[PDB]
Every structure is written in C-alpha cells, then in structure tokens.
C-alpha cells in the first residue's frame, strides 16, 4: 500500500509495469504482501530461451529502492548464472545496483542475462560447461525447460 517510501515506490513500479510493460515481462505484487511480487519473463527472441514463459518471485525489503530485492526463478531454469534453487547471479542485484532501477528494469536485465550469460558466475556448472563447449547440447537443455515453463507444476 502507501505506508512507507518503499511501498509507495513499489506501487509506482507496479503502475509503470501495468501501463507500460517492457516486451515479454509482467509482474504484480502478491495479493497479501506488497513486498513479494510474482513475475513472468518471456525468453528473448533469437535465443534458445525464445517461447519460454518463466515465473519468478521477487522479495523486497523496506530499504527498496536503495537495497536490491532478491529474485528467484520459480520455473525450472537451465542457465549458467542461475542456481538449482532458482537464485540468480546478476550484477545489478549484487554489485551494480542503482536506486533508479525498478521492477521493469530488473526483469529486463534478467531477460538480457538469459541471452548473454556472465562467465564470471558459473552458478550452474553444467549449464556453464555446455554453454562454453557445446552450444547445440546447451540449447537442447534450454529447449526442454522452455517447454516445461508452459506448465506450472
């Protein structure tokens, strides 16, 4: 709601996302908790993640937007910078956070991450190994989770 600066800022992020969502992204606060959002990122076109519809949750603190939220993929993911539990290694969530970034820019940065993995953070050792040694097999694995992202188990 509107009780703290972080909550009003989150409402403004929500407004931006409603009326002007970047391509292939969506998100909204949970019904009972403005600090926890559900989001969906569509895989960027021209990439192995194309056609993928990936759910994520985002958890904000009352320090937002000064402190970045923690973002986790809910859908199964196969990507060098994404752990088995869904946690994400993203520069703007760790080292390059700016209070100018909102939910929209966070979702697009992850969308871009899917296209261009950061080789400094091999969170998924097999995904990193295949990405640097076997693009075909890498894309085979990504295709599998793309299809699985259409089903929300």
Tokens of 5: 């600066």
3-state DSSP of 83-105: CCCCEECCHHHHCCCCCCCCHHH
Phi, psi (rounded to 5 degrees) for 42: -85, 140
Of 10, 40, 88, 89, which one is the catalytic site residue?
Answer: 89
Host domain of residue 22: 1-153
CATH of the domain at 74: 3.10.110.10
Technique employed here was: X-ray
Task: Give the DSSP H or E segment for 6.
Answer: helix 5-19
Is 153 assigned a catalytic role?
A: no
Burial of 88 (0-12, 13-18, 19+ CB in 10 A): buried
The full DSSP string for 18-80 is HHSPPTTEEEEE-SS-TTEEEEEEEBPTTSTTBT-EEEEEEE--TTTTTSPPEEEE-S----T
Q: DSSP letter at 82?
A: B
Name the domain count of the chain.
1
Distance between CA atoms of residues 108 and 106, nearest Å: 5
């Amino acid at each position: 709601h509107m009780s703290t600066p972080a909550r009003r800022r989150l409402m403004r992020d929500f407004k931006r996302l409603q009326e002007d969502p970047p391509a292939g992204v969506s998100g909204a606060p949970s019904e009972n908790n403005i600090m926890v959002w559900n989001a969906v990122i569509f895989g960027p076109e021209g990439t192995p993640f194309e056609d993928g519809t990936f759910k994520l949750t985002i958890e904000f603190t009352e320090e937002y937007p000064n402190k970045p939220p923690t973002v986790r993929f809910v859908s199964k993911m196969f990507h060098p910078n994404v752990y088995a539990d869904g946690s994400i290694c993203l520069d703007i969530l760790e080292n390059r956070w700016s209070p100018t970034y909102d939910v929209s820019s966070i979702l697009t940065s992850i969308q871009s991450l899917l296209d261009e993995p950061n080789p400094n953070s091999p969170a998924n050792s097999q995904a990193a190994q295949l990405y640097q040694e076997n693009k075909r097999e890498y894309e085979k694995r990504v295709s599998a989770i793309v299809e699985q992202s259409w089903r929300d188990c």
